[PDB]
Amino acid sequence: MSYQSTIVPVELHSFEDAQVIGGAFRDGDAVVFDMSLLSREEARRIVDFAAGLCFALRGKMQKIDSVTFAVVPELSNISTSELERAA
Amino acid sequence: MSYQSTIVPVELHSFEDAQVIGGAFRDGDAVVFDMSLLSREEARRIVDFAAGLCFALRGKMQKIDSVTFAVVPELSNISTSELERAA
Ligand SMILES: [Zn+2]
Ligand SMILES: [Zn+2]
Ligand SMILES: [Zn+2]
Ligand SMILES: [Zn+2]
Ligand SMILES: [Zn+2]
Ligand SMILES: [Zn+2]
């Protein structure tokens, strides 16, 4: 999309995958992350890291479904349907 | 200090503290936080949120002692002694 930004759909495997969300989101991309392969404890760690990542850059965090969340950059205008489609 | 930065010392009581650490760090302040009064689960949540803040803004997370951590902004030159003094 315009201004070097896209939606990165990723599948998480463990807490080290916090860096995958981090790398893309810090570079101005929205990230839609699937936590289906994580334990509830691992998923809580990812969501807390993602909340930190989002707060630092004035982004928005949203829950797509039971296992999928998204981090959206500050000046981005991405609807839930677009994040849902990317998921 | 220069460019709207300081050291903010905080005794933490809950995960509600994440937005307080976040609010100050995102503006370029170093934050030194004592987690002695948190459960082990709450302390892990704070550290995961703080790792997300650090990643987003290229900051440094430093363990001061068993219960005290600090988040230092990217271009800040704060020693361990200064963070220890503020704690
Ligand atoms: Zn494009
Ligand atoms: Zn991995
Ligand atoms: Zn000052
Ligand atoms: Zn300041
Ligand atoms: Zn408190
Ligand atoms: Zn309590």
Author numbering:
A (entry chain A), B (entry chain B): 63 to 149
Question: What does the article say, verbatim?
Answer:
At the cell division site, FtsZ protofilaments form a highly dynamic, membrane-bound structure, the Z-ring, which serves as a scaffold for the recruitment of the extra-cytoplasmic cell wall biosynthetic machinery. Here we investigate the physiological function of Corynebacterium glutamicum SepF, the only cell division-associated protein from Actinobacteria known to interact with the conserved C-terminal tail of FtsZ. Our structural data revealed the FtsZ-binding pocket, defining the SepF homodimer as the functional unit, and suggesting a reversible β-sheet-mediated oligomerization interface possibly regulated via an alpha helical switch. We found that FtsZ filaments and lipid membranes have opposing effects on SepF polymerization, pointing to a complex dynamic role of the protein at the division site, involving FtsZ bundling, Z-ring tethering and membrane reshaping activities that are needed for proper Z-ring assembly and function.
Helix α3 formation and stabilization were not due to FtsZ binding, because the crystal structure of unliganded SepFΔML revealed the same overall structure than FtsZCTD-bound SepFΔML (rmsd of 0.83 Å for 160 equivalent Cα atoms in the homodimer), indicating that peptide binding produced no significant conformational changes. The presence of this helix has important functional implications as it caps the β-sheet that was previously described as the dimerization interface of B. subtilis SepF11. If the functional SepF unit is conserved, the β-sheet-mediated interface observed in B. subtilis SepF crystals could therefore mediate protein polymerization in solution. This interface, which was also seen in SepF-like proteins from Pyrococcus furiosus and Archaeoglobus fulgidus, is precluded in the C. glutamicum SepF structure by the presence of the C-terminal helix α3. However, inspection of the unliganded SepFΔML structure revealed that this helix displays considerably higher B-factor values than the rest of the protein and a similar trend is also observed in the SepFΔML–FtsZCTD complex, suggesting that helix α3 could play a regulatory role on SepF polymerization by uncovering the outer face of the β-sheet for intermolecular interactions.
